[PDB]
From a paper:
Mediator of ERBB2-driven cell motility 1 (MEMO1) is an evolutionary conserved protein implicated in many biological processes; however, its primary molecular function remains unknown. MEMO1 is a highly conserved protein found in the cytosol of eukaryotic cells from yeast to humans. We conclude that MEMO1 is an iron-binding protein that modulates iron homeostasis in cancer cells. Our work reveals that the iron coordination mode in MEMO1 is very similar to that of iron-containing extradiol dioxygenases, which also display a similar structural fold.
To confirm the iron-binding site, we generated H49A and C244S mutants, along with H192A and D189N variants, because the latter residues are located in the proximity of the bound iron and were previously proposed to belong to the metal-binding site of the protein. All the mutant proteins were properly folded as shown by NMR. As shown by ITC, iron-binding affinity in the H192A and D189N mutants is not significantly changed, whereas H49A and C244S variants do not bind iron at all. Consistent with the crucial role of C244 in metal binding, no metal density was found in the C244S variant of MEMO1 crystallized in the presence of copper. Thus, metal coordination in MEMO1 is achieved by H49, H81, and C244, while H192 and D189 do not participate in metal binding in MEMO1.
Numbering used by the authors: 4 to 297
Amino acid sequence: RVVCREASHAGSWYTASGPQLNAQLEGWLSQVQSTKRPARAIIAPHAGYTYCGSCAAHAYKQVDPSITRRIFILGPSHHVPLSRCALSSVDIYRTPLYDLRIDQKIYGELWKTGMFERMSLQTDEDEHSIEMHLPYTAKAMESHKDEFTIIPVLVGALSESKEQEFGKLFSKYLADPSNLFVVSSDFCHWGQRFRYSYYDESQGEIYRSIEHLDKMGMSIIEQLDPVSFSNYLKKYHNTISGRHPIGVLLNAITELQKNGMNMSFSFLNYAQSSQCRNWQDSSVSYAAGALTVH
Ligand SMILES: N[C@@H](CCC(=O)N[C@@H](CS)C(=O)NCC(=O)O)C(=O)O
């Protein structure tokens, strides 16, 4: 049995040198003023750090490392035909900063729901959408580096009913101030290379239409409304890569509202990998945001 998941995208999606990566993350985090501490959930991108690291800092700066003790990371599956969610087979997730330990107690509880499959080590290491949050998490939590655990969850192509069921399942954990939910997603992938060319001419340039479409989705997320978000996906089919983890989060939020809790979500930074101006251009969008529970 292999006990460690190697940092299989280090050096290609982010800097492999621990000390240099540490300084790069520190630099991006220093440019952000914390406004939403202590975040109970964040939405953050999963592209290479050269493209999205500055944006992701706006989410990670909202984590209060003196409060958060367990960090769920829900990332969408890119390679495998997964219809449910999957849990890791290893005990430790490596990063160039320091290695992260999976919460064995919660992993046992989750497994006993019967709702999860077990992803192989090969599946685990092939996916990047969880790994891209490990260095940032390690950096955000370094002042308490030996006092927190992670709960990695691979999120497949969930049906609406599975988004509802997993949302209700995770809601009991979302209600605990010691827990943090990292919801991994990029926003619009625009261009012929993505077979996506939706364009609202009332917005002007293509990149402004992309910004408007993304921000329609971001505003719906801020309305805490999973049905509205599903309807928006059905209407425009925006290529939001973590739409299923987001659907899980929104259903968890509505479950907590039914239990009498009150919540607020705010997006804090929006960016595009480039600015599309003609039909042959392509770009990927990034958005960072935080959920506050009082
Ligand atoms: N170096 C990595 C990452 C490259 C990368 O991050 N590309 C951007 C687009 S310029 C991106 O957004 N990737 C994640 C996504 O498409 O959602 C690779 O070769 O795939």
